[PDB]
Each structure stands twice: as C-alpha cells, then as structure tokens.
Amino acid sequence: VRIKLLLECTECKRRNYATEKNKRNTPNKLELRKYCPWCRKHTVHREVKI
Amino acid sequence: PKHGKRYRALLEKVDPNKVYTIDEAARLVKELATAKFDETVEVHAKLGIDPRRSDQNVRGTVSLPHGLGKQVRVLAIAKGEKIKEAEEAGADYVGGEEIIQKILDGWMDFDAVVATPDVMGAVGSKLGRILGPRGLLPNPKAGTVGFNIGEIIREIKAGRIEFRNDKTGAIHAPVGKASFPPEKLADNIRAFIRALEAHKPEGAKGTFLRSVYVTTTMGPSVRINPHS
Amino acid sequence: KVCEISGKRPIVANSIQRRGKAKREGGVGKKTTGISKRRQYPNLQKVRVRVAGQEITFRVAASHIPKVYELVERAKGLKLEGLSPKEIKKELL
RNA sequence: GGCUACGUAGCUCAGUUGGUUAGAGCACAUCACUCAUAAUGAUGGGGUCACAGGUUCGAAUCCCGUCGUAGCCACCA
RNA sequence: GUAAGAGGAGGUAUAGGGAGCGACGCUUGCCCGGUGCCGGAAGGUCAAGGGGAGGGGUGCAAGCCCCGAACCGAAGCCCCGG
RNA sequence: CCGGGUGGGGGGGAGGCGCCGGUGAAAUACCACCCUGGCGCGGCUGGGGGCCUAACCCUCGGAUGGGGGGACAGCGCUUGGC
RNA sequence: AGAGCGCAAGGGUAGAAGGGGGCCUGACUGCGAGGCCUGCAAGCCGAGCAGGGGCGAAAGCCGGGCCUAGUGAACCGGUGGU
C-alpha cells in the first residue's frame, strides 16, 4: 500500500538507477542514500518520481 | 495646471507615440530629467505574474553594473562574530543582540538590515511590522540572511535592485540620477533587462517584457522596445 | 440525381463516417484501437434561369454554378430559337 | 485521472472583494406574565468558517494540498 | 418507399392516429423518492468550429509547415418545477 | 460611506502647500506603471426582434403573371449526441 | 529455552536469529561455477571473480530482514535517458 510510495533512486551524473521505496507516513523526506550505479563506485543516488 | 508647467514642456517631449529604447532613453532621458536632482531612471517594469500567484514575487537582487547612490549603512544585528564582518564593511551599529532595541525601542537609520541567521529569529521576531513589511528585515534574501551579507553589503551599496511584484511586477529600476550621461544609462538599463531575465518564473504566460518605462521620474516615459 | 455539368454520383459503405472510435493518442491511445464502417452521400441542387427564348432548369452540382453561367455566355453566341426546351438545353452543353 | 461547484451554531445558514465585530431560523437555558398551561418577551450558553500550509499589519472573505461531494466528460496495458 | 410520390384525405380536431378496460347501474384512496413524459432566457460539463499568448524544425534571410493557451460556443445528461 | 468627495460654470481676489515633528502596514504638494467596479467609442466576435423580396416552398380559370411563405423550410456534406 | 523472534502455522532458535548502542547505508556494478525443481515457461540456493565502499585493531562480515505467501509472460503505451 501507498503512503510508502515507491521510487527509482535516480543518480546525478546524468542517470544510472537503483530502485527502492519511500515512507511518507514516516518523517522521511526525499532521500539521497549512498548507492552504486551501473557505472562507477558508491557515489551518490537521490530520489525521483514514482 | 496639473503636472506642473515644467512637465508641459516635458509634455512637449513625448507625443504619445514612441519607444526610445535604452539608447534614446539614455541620451534623451538624460534630457528628460531637467528639473531637480537624482531621478532614478524609474524603469517601470511590468509583466503579469498574477499579482501574487502565491510565489511569483521575485526579489530581484541586482548589482546594477555601475552603482547605486547614497548610504544604506546596512547596520546588521550580527551575533558577535559577524558584527566584525559588518565592522569592516559599510555597516554601523552592528550590536549583535542589543541594537535590536535601537530598532524596536526607537532608533532607526539603515536599510536591508543584513543581520544573520541567528538574529533572523531574534531580530526578525521583534521587527516584523515595520522593517520587513516596508522593505528591511532578514527576508531570507533581501541581502539579509547569512555572511554572504557583507559581500551583499557591497551589493546594497554598489547595486542592490530589489524587485517586488505588487500589482505589475512593477519594479522601478533605479540609477540615472540625471548626471550619468547616455553612457552609464545605456549599459545600466541593459543590465536591468538582464536582471529581469535573471529572475524568470515557472509558468507565467504573459508579456515578460512590457512596461519598461525609463522615465527618470519627473519626465516623459515611452518604454524601451522592451528588450534592447 | 447526377450533376448535368461534371457527372459526380453517390458514394457508399467505406464511403463513410465509420464511427470507428479511432486510435490516436491519449495514454496507450486516445482510446486506442477503435474501429467501424459507413456511408456518404454527395451534394446535388437545382437552379432556374431564363436565357434565350424560354426558361430552363439545371440539376447543377454544388461548386459548378459559374460553369453554368459560362454556358449562358456560350449560348448567347449560338443561334437559339424555336420551340425546343430540353432539345436546345441538350445542345448548349 | 480532467473539468466545475460546495460543505461555518446540535439541526439549518447566508454572509459573498477583505480589515468584522463571528448571524437568522428552530434546539437548550432562566426570569416576566397569568388562575396556570401553551401564545409571548428578554438575557445568556452554543459557532472552533470542509482540515491544514501561505500573499496580507488584520482571510469566512484571495492562492494552494488532501478530504467529503455530486455533475457530466473522459482514460486505462 | 433510398426516393419520386403515395395512402390518410377531393378528410379538417364532434376529424384522423395510439394505448388502455370492454354493456349498462354504483366507484376510483396513498407517493415525484426512481424512471419516463412534460415545462424552463440561471448555473455545470461537453463535439466540430473561432481564436491566437507561448513553442518547435529549418534556411544567412524573406519565409513554408506543424504543436498550440485564455475566452466564446448548442443538442444532450445534471439543475428548478409540474 | 447620508459624510462628504468630483468637476464645469462663474462672483472673484493676493495667495495655497509636502515635510523631519505626529499616527498607523502605510503619509496625503509634485512625477512614474497597473489590478478591482463602472461610462463612452474603437480591435475581434457573437445574442434577440421586427420591415421588404429576388433565392427556394405552396396554390390560382395555361399562370408569360396574381398571391402567400420568405431568408424559415427543404437539400447535400461535416458536428456531437440521444 | 514452554519467552521473544512484524502479520498463518510449521519448523528452527538463546554457543541468537532475541533486547540496547556507536559509525554508517551491500533492498551495490559487470558476472556467474553448479545444483533443487519441473513438460514447457517460470520459480530457486548460490562458491568464487573484477570495481568500489561501510564496519571492526584484526580474523572477517555486507548482492536486504530466521525462514516457508507479500505475485502477473508477452505484446499496446508513458516518463527520464543512449
């Protein structure tokens, strides 16, 4: 169920993804959690859309 | 017998059918100020961002690539350390948490206020009825929150412009002073066009360049072909 | 009926208005897919002028009226006379 | 999902461009009358302006997010 | 009947079409909440159409072509009522 | 706004002011761009009604004409809808 | 070890998988040895390797949570992007 809406953590550097899920019912805002894209290393990873 | 006699001569200088541009406004609006003192260009800048649109207020914050005029003095109410910042700029009476009573209990004489984040709270929670509503206070961008605030003291003394969009977008672009020839006026009003285009909206359909009118103040008007 | 100027007769079946519903765009489609079939009539009218001896009617098509007027102009040069309504009308063109 | 509108006293409600200061109708309440009832009169209790954020020195009065809500449009692998 | 025209009807609302019960003698109560039928110069949505703020491709350029807002639109269903 | 504001006509006659001071968000001489509510005519583009016939519709002893209907209908496409 | 181990049980578990805390954020990238399962199609456990990163002095751990459900082939499209 939503209020926990899902998102695809898009990274900077012009794309590269890892897929997750939020939590609106929790104080969780946007999320720039440290993950590793298809190209490079454990750099950044932010949050976009659904 | 209305706008004076002088602006009936200065009426014999528009013939409600022109544009002038920043060119003829530079030279000719240098002429169209012949009266008193430092009539600041009044670029009357108008668009149509729905006279509130919750957000569309701009703040237009521009260095005026030439110079402002008199002394704002800034003041600052900067919690100790940043007093010292102001203490090297053009800012007098910095008193971190006590000149607040020399603003709330009487004393005045300063613009912008720059302050700092700390005192934003403090000195914005004791001055939100005269300074900020009229045109001073922390206003988290009126050159008034942070330490990017003495550099922006240099901005309040060398070129602020303030855009606030009440009923038109309005803003009264301010230089001219009726003593900066065609030169400085040309390059400065151009700088202002760049300022308008520096603060672009997020869905404002309408004329994002009509009214410019470059009337210094006590003289003509007639736009600038709202661009050049 | 049929235009006495440039022919042009009725039109049927996938002459049409289909309904269809039609595809196009809106999501995966406007309503995507969408498809059916129909029928299409042509125009036809009638105009009466005089010209020459007697009066005359034409089952003229739609946009072909000044063609008929031009036929009037052609008629005036020709030698029209006697009692022969459609017989002369035939000849006109 | 898109376009409209609207929900403020317990029920029922306008007020509608601000800048007001929260009504009207029954409902509750007590005193006045009278043989006493109801008819009556009066003073008060009760509004938390659909919930919340903001433009404004002062939104019920404008901007926005969700609800509730019906209208029809209109969309779905 | 696609029609042309035809019947109706060389009839005219004491006429001609439909439905309902089926002499005559006595009789006909509750509801517009639904639905249909009716009646309506407010209001809602809404088809093509008008429109043109913004916008794209392209060519040096004049330009050609397309996307296309605000606002205007009826029949219809909702809405007021019988 | 029952208080007064607006302006013309004019009697007229040597004069009438903004301010820091004061009050509030905000200061009223003088200048610069527009929103709200309307007046008057313009851009664009529609709503209702009446007057006439020459289109087209009906009828009159052959009607070349009279008459009425009259921009309606009818008709062909295109529109949605029931 | 009958407690607790999110929600059904079964099973297992304190020589932790429970209960508190510091630093983080491996619900990583490129793969894939080989098996369970089974008509297919999916489902399934995953040594070990190369980049890089967290923890811990280190040994060593991290390709989600004690586990057995928390699922939807393919076209048709939608957004970001090469």
From Swiss-Prot, chain A:
Gene3D superfamilies from the UniProt entry: Ribosomal protein L33
Superkingdom of the source species: Bacteria
Keywords, ordered alphabetically: Ribonucleoprotein, Ribosomal protein
GO molecular function, one term: structural constituent of ribosome
Gene Ontology CC annotations of this record: cytoplasm; ribonucleoprotein complex; ribosome
UniProt record, GO biological process: translation
UniProt-listed InterPro entries: Ribosomal_bL33 (IPR001705), Ribosomal_bL33_CS (IPR018264), Ribosomal_bL33_sf (IPR038584), Ribosomal_zn-bd (IPR011332)
One Pfam short name: Ribosomal_L33
PROSITE patterns in alphabetical order: RIBOSOMAL_L33 (PS00582)
PANTHER family: 50S RIBOSOMAL PROTEIN L33, CHLOROPLASTIC, LARGE RIBOSOMAL SUBUNIT PROTEIN BL33C
NCBIfam families: PRK00504.1, PRK00595.1, rpmG_bact
Family assignment from sequence similarity: Belongs to the bacterial ribosomal protein bL33 family.
Protein name: Large ribosomal subunit protein bL33
Curated annotation (Swiss-Prot), chain B:
Alphabetized GO MF terms: rRNA binding; structural constituent of ribosome; tRNA binding
Gene name as annotated: rplA
Disulfide topology: none
Family to which this protein belongs: Belongs to the universal ribosomal protein uL1 family.
The protein, known as: Large ribosomal subunit protein uL1
Subunit structure: Part of the 50S ribosomal subunit.
GO cellular component, as recorded: large ribosomal subunit
Species lineage: Bacteria, Thermotogati, Deinococcota, Deinococci, Thermales
BP GO annotations: regulation of translation; translation
One Pfam family linked to the record: Ribosomal_L1
Keywords per UniProt: Repressor, Ribonucleoprotein, Ribosomal protein, RNA-binding, rRNA-binding, Translation regulation, tRNA-binding
Function: Binds directly to 23S rRNA. The L1 stalk is quite mobile in the ribosome, and is involved in E site tRNA release.
PROSITE patterns: RIBOSOMAL_L1
Swiss-Prot record, chain C:
GO CC annotation: ribonucleoprotein complex; ribosome
Keyword Ribosomal protein: yes
InterPro entries: Bacterial_rp_bL28, Ribosomal_bL28, Ribosomal_bL28/bL31-like_sf, Ribosomal_bL28_bact-type
Any Pfam family the entry gives: Ribosomal_L28
An annotated Gene Ontology molecular function: structural constituent of ribosome
Annotated keywords: Ribonucleoprotein, Ribosomal protein
Source superkingdom: Bacteria
Family affiliation: Belongs to the bacterial ribosomal protein bL28 family.
Protein name, entry field: Large ribosomal subunit protein bL28
Organism of this sequence: Thermus thermophilus (strain ATCC BAA-163 / DSM 7039 / HB27)
